[PDB]
Write a protein that binds this ligand. Structure first.
Ligand SMILES: Cc1cc2nc3c(=O)[nH]c(=O)nc-3n(C[C@H](O)[C@H](O)[C@H](O)COP(=O)(O)OP(=O)(O)OC[C@H]3O[C@@H](n4cnc5c(N)ncnc54)[C@H](O)[C@@H]3O)c2cc1C
Ligand SMILES: Cc1cc2nc3c(=O)[nH]c(=O)nc-3n(C[C@H](O)[C@H](O)[C@H](O)COP(=O)(O)OP(=O)(O)OC[C@H]3O[C@@H](n4cnc5c(N)ncnc54)[C@H](O)[C@@H]3O)c2cc1C
Lengths: 318, 336
């Protein structure tokens, strides 16, 4: 089933781009890697208020996503969720085939890369080496079940909302809870960050800022203890059964890095029409680069309008 | 006196740029030649619905202007209305002076040109010539206030919504209302045109299609009589102490076209940072040209953001810029 434009990524840029397709009477689909649309706004800061998007005095990120989506849904674009585009091919006839990780192939007359800053892979502690054999047993990047943390000695890495929340949530579940953050202070300093220090002074938990995991110990295929290190060179070891790492998400082009396209500082280089080196292949948003590019919402919206507009000369040359 | 940025023009691009100034902790002024903000939106299509602005499914143009203003008024920026910037000078210190048509001068450390397609000015009737001594007192190009027309015998010229609106508006307020328009039909339509037509029918008002104003009479420096001529050749006179001219706004790029700055088909040529050749002098919106420029609202909005962002390097030279997002930056000042 041929569409005019395949859009890779369902952040604010891909969404507005899908609206642009409707507005301009071309069919499209959005292929999105996450289980929901909204990109960085829905994932990293859904509840935080945005101030610098035109005509929205003060708007929670996730509401803006909803405003943008409602605007585009009128035109009923195909939305593919839970699929990551890993390859494409331009065919003899100029049309496109884009492939996702589930082996699904998608046909379009042209394509728009609106993939931002990656597909939200959890960031790790690579200083610990390849510890896949511990992963999902004693080392976690998310809490898919509290069972795993129950009556266990657990250290928690991070200083955002996820690391904070779970430090208090596991006090009652776990034998011990220890928070360790690289930063000087905690990020997202609100209601939940106003009462974090309590259990620290109380002695029910341990908190360490300015410290990082230096190494770990294991016995019979399970974590035994965690070595810590502060900025001043202070080093100590702590007994730990579980490691819970919540330090955000990685930022790179993922599979799109190995598409033979001009790059400039982890972004796709783009001309005055938002076109890559390959005709009918466009980029817009955080992922696109041109002299003067700002990586903000306002600017991604403009770029989506310009990509879609020029794409009409490729899709239907009239 | 001194502001960080002088913004020439208060269309959507200028209003957003003023908001951007506030976001970036710099002061500014908007200089606008119209009696209100809004540019082509307020002037040419206020009631028309806009569909292609991000996050707005449907919005009357004038409501969009209102939303953008509501956003900008957070920082209470200076607003100079009814003045047209005619020139600028870059002084020896690198700061700027802008001069308007009323002889006022404004100082700033940098300037953004967000002048669109030109200064909007009320269209005038040449057949009357220089009547500036009557303008503001017995002759008007817009209703500055309704009290100007209370108990007056008024004539209104035009066939759009504004002419139609104030015709029915001033019926109970004024003592005599005459509407003239040089077209054979009214271009404003709907609720208003029929109210006017019903008022014509029972003779509460005079209305004359295909009629243009020929001449006026005046006594004591005030309007006294208006002379009209139809399309068939008719020619008559009304007793009128008030004349309201409402035949539209005209865009006039004139003064800025005579500046020493490169143009591409009436647009000021700009670089990757929305800067013209003169450092500290920026352009954004419909007035800005760079390869691939689309003359639309969405595009002027992000251009305003890029121009204000870079202007910081000229306004505050050498100063290290801290790349915070608005969301995080407004959270830090909510804590403090
Ligand atoms: C904490 C924080 C606060 C911010 N606050 C502001 C602010 O106040 N104002 C502002 O203007 N900007 C702000 N930003 C930046 C803003 O979020 C981004 O500029 C914006 O999200 C860019 O949208 P985008 O569509 O270009 O990219 P993204 O939001 O990154 O969306 C890209 C989408 O593509 C998907 N994807 C990636 N690869 C593939 C693949 N190969 N196949 C299928 N899908 C894929 C991803 O899952 C993602 O949904 C903030 C950023 C952060 C982190
Ligand atoms: C009928 C019509 C419908 C349109 N519909 C849409 C639409 O649906 N969607 C869309 O995206 N775009 C639309 N547009 C285009 C859109 O209006 C413009 O892109 C937009 O107005 C540009 O904004 P701007 O602020 O940069 O310029 P402008 O809106 O033109 O504002 C410039 C302002 O500067 C003032 N000015 C100029 N020179 C001086 C000076 N020397 N001194 C003081 N003040 C000065 C002017 O009076 C004016 O108020 C439409 C245009 C028209 C004519």
């Amino acid at each position: 089933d041929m569409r005019d434009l395949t859009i890779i990524g369902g952040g604010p840029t891909g969404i507005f781009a899908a609206f642009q397709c409707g507005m301009n009477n071309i069919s499209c689909r959005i292929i999105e890697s996450m289980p929901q649309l909204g990109g960085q706004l829905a994932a990293l800061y859904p509840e935080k208020h945005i101030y610098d998007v035109a005509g929205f005095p003060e708007v929670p990120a996730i509401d803006l996503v909803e405003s943008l989506w409602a605007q585009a849904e009128r035109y009923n674009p195909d939305v593919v969720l839970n699929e990551t585009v890993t390859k494409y091919t331009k065919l003899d006839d100029g049309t496109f085939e884009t492939r996702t990780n589930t082996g699904n192939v998608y046909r379009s007359r042209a394509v728009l890369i609106a993939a931002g800053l990656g597909a939200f892979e959890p960031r790790k502690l690579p200083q610990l080496g390849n510890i896949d054999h511990l992963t999902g047993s004693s080392v976690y990047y998310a809490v898919k079940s509290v069972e795993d943390f129950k009556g266990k000695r657990v250290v928690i890495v991070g200083g955002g909302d996820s690391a904070l929340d779970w430090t208090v949530g596991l006090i009652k579940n776990a034998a011990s809870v220890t928070l360790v953050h690289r930063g000087h202070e905690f990020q997202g300093h609100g209601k939940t960050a106003h009462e974090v220090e309590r259990a620290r002074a109380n002695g029910t938990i341990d908190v360490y800022l300015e410290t990082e995991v230096a190494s770990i110990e294991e016995s019979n295929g399970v974590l035994t203890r965690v070595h810590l290190r502060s900025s001043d060179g202070s080093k100590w070891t702590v007994e730990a059964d579980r490691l819970l790492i919540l330090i955000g998400f990685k930022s790179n082009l993922g599979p799109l890095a190995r598409w033979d396209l001009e790059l400039y500082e982890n972004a796709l280089v783009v001309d005055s029409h938002m076109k890559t080196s390959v005709d009918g292949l466009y980029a817009a948003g955080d992922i696109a680069y041109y002299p003067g590019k700002l990586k903000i919402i306002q600017t991604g919206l403009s770029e989506a309008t310009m990509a879609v507009r020029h794409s009409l000369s490729y899709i239907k040359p009239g």
